Write a protein that binds this ligand. Structure first.
Ligand SMILES: CCCCCCCCCCCCCCCC(=O)O
Length: 276
């Protein structure tokens, strides 16, 4: 088979170990503070942790921006020079960011073949189809076949993004959408859909799993990526609760990056779900 590089953007919150394990690179989007300071959303443990403290203490909530066309071109040329034959890019929902269009535009100006997939998802749900793509490629599947299957998986809603936030004001401030209240959301057709408000994390956790249950019977086989915005204990509880009604053949936790955290706010907990 040919050598295929897989690239997701930083809003995919890819598990750190997956970069090497599945040869998945991550392109940084940016966080720009009101004072003009700009910083890349790199998948580095300590850097993300440092960002959590800073956004929690900041006097304002920063804005975010897609990678530049130049940023994408740079990556594509780098992979060509690393002898890759093709580049498979999976971006977050085109309805949530201009990242998809930027990746597509850049793909037109470079020599190496670049296929861009609008996942219509965000955060931890994105690395799921990315890994499925690598597994299929490794077994000799062609790009055309991979794109075909992913399209089917999407049609059957096999990849889900369900989560809840602690302070809804972050999402409102971001533009994409009381005491102890928790707002539960899920991504549908690439858009953020608030579907419930509850009190406390236990109920929020239960509501996330209830939402999953609407089309995925308990006992179903899954692969999961639990995500959190500086609330590891919170997502651990979520996955522990999930294991009691489903057959989780694989799970891993990944911290939400600077860009996702800027929009959802600290305290957020949720999971990317792949229905096997
Ligand atoms: C896996 C479950 C968690 C899902 C979390 C979804 C969070 C969505 C928040 C909106 C992010 C918008 C990013 C805009 C980036 C840009 O500036 O172009």
């Amino acid at each position: 088979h040919m050598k295929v590089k897989i690239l997701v953007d930083s809003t995919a919150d890819v598990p750190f170990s997956w970069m090497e394990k599945y040869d998945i690179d991550s392109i940084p989007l940016y966080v720009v503070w009101e004072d003009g300071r700009s910083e890349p959303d790199e998948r580095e443990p300590e850097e993300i942790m440092n960002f959590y403290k800073r956004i929690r203490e900041a006097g304002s909530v920063p804005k975010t921006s897609q990678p530049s066309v130049e940023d994408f071109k740079k990556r594509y040329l780098k992979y060509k020079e690393e002898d890759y034959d093709v580049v498979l890019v999976l971006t977050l929902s085109s309805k949530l960011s201009g990242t998809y269009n930027s990746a597509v535009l850049a793909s037109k100006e470079v020599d190496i073949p670049v296929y861009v997939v609008d996942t219509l998802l965000a955060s931890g749900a994105i690395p799921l189809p990315a890994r499925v793509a690598r597994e299929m490629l490794e077994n000799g599947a062609t790009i055309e076949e991979v794109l075909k299957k992913l399209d089917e998986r999407m049609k059957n809603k096999d990849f889900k993004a369900i989560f809840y936030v602690s302070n809804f004001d972050y999402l409102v401030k971001g533009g994409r959408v009381l005491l102890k209240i928790r707002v539960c959301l899920h991504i549908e057709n690439g858009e953020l859909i608030p579907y419930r408000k509850v009190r406390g994390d236990k109920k929020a956790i239960e509501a996330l799993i209830e939402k999953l249950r609407e089309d995925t019977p308990e006992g179903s086989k899954l692969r999961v990526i639990g995500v959190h915005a500086d609330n590891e204990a919170g997502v651990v509880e979520l996955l522990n609760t999930l294991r009691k009604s489903y057959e989780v053949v694989d799970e891993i936790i990944s911290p939400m990056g600077k860009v996702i955290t800027t929009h959802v706010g600290p305290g957020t907990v949720g999971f990317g779900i792949e229905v096997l």
